[PDB]
Design a protein around this nucleic acid. Structure first.
Lengths: 152, 75
DNA sequence: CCCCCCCGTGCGCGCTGAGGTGCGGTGTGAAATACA
């Protein structure tokens, strides 16, 4: 299982100071699917994180990732928006064949299309040095904080 | 390409003292490389009416500005 | 107790906002299928 629990959320907050319930919202139904997803993964080495942008940036319309931390536990936060929708079990198997960790530290929920912080978080992350973007941002963030007149 | 602000165009014209219609229109349309308002003006489909109004407003402003002066101050 | 004529057509370019209606992105479970 390990949909999204209080423990991962606590260290997520301790690192990026914004919740996972405020960037996504709720499904405990591990059957309901979606193409877009969010993810934060724990206990990762930076080399395979940089290679994670490498590997994933085949098959998704966008991909954002950012990294921490301070001597207390690493929370590599992803933003994943695949090409064809895949369930929490399928994307769970993908990422837990990706990151050489347990099924524990996965954070799978669809992103929330109406919400301010839900795109402010990634809009701030987009300027971070270790952030790795590919192509157009998904229409949710790329709707909430952008889609504004490029040159009036 | 934000909404055209006729006030800004008249302000620019009176800033440069351009008064006659042709100089206003041509000189403005040549300043589209830096003025967002310039591309805004070029986008619209009523350029002639706007330049006509801009010329008239600049004429009013210069006319009153000159007539305000007293002949000692004018000399 | 039933037919021998009335009758010559459609609108300021352009907006644009409250209004509500629906099949779905996503709402996400008790029932429901089958397992062992």
């Amino acid at each position: 299982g390990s949909r999204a629990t209080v423990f991962k959320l606590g260290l997520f907050k301790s690192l990026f100071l914004c919740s996972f319930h405020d960037i996504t919202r709720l499904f405990k139904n591990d059957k309901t699917t979606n193409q877009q997803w969010v993810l934060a993964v724990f206990g990762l080495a930076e080399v395979f994180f940089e290679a994670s942008f490498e590997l994933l940036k085949k098959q998704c319309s966008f991909l954002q990732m950012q990294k921490r931390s301070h001597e207390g536990g690493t929370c590599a936060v992803y933003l994943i928006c695949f090409n064809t929708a895949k369930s929490r079990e399928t994307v769970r198997n993908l990422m837990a064949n990706m990151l050489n960790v347990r099924e524990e530290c996965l954070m799978l929920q669809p992103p929330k299309i109406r919400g301010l912080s839900a795109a402010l978080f990634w809009f701030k992350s987009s300027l971070s040095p270790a952030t790795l973007k590919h192509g157009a941002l998904p229409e949710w963030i790329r709707a909430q904080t952008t889609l504004n007149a490029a040159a009036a | 390409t934000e909404k055209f602000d006729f006030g800004t165009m008249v302000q620019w014209a009176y800033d440069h003292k351009y008064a006659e219609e042709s100089k206003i229109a041509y000189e403005y349309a040549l300043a589209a490389g830096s003025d967002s308002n310039a591309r805004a003006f070029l986008a619209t489909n009523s350029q002639a009416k706007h330049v006509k109004d801009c010329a008239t407003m600049v004429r009013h402003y210069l006319r009153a500005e000159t007539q305000a002066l007293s002949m000692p101050a004018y000399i």
